[PDB]
Amino acid sequence: VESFASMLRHSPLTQMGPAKDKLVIGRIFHIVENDLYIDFGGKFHCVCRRPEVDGEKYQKGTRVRLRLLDLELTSRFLGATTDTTVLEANAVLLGIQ
């Protein structure tokens, strides 16, 4: 059997390093008007505006490429004891495939 520490080591989410400026492919799984909801793996999904150039091959199931500025997007504010999460990661949609 393979231990969870070995699993975590030979997991791609750990071999990625920090999410910043890492090119990751993902799928579109939900659309609202022009707000594409893309998964890139990991815990959360990202939301990206539909690019107006070539804006019709961005449908449910499309493979896109993402830059992944952030992985969870949390921040603590002035009076808070825990931080305010938005349950969503940050990424920039660069194209298809």
Contacts with other proteins by CB under 8 A lie at 2-18, 21-26, 29, 39-44, 60, 65, 71-72, 74, 76, 81-83, 85, 87
Residue closer to other proteins by CB (options 39, 51) is 39
The token pair at 51 is 């690019």
Query: Cβ neighbours of residue 73 under 8 Å, at least 6 residues apart?
Result: 85, 86, 88, 89, 90
Least spacing, CB of residue 88 vs other proteins, in Å? 10
Least spacing, CB of residue 92 vs other proteins, in Å? 13
**74 HSE (CA, 13 A, CB side):** 11
Least spacing, CB of residue 54 vs other proteins, in Å? 19
- Count of residues making up the chain: 97
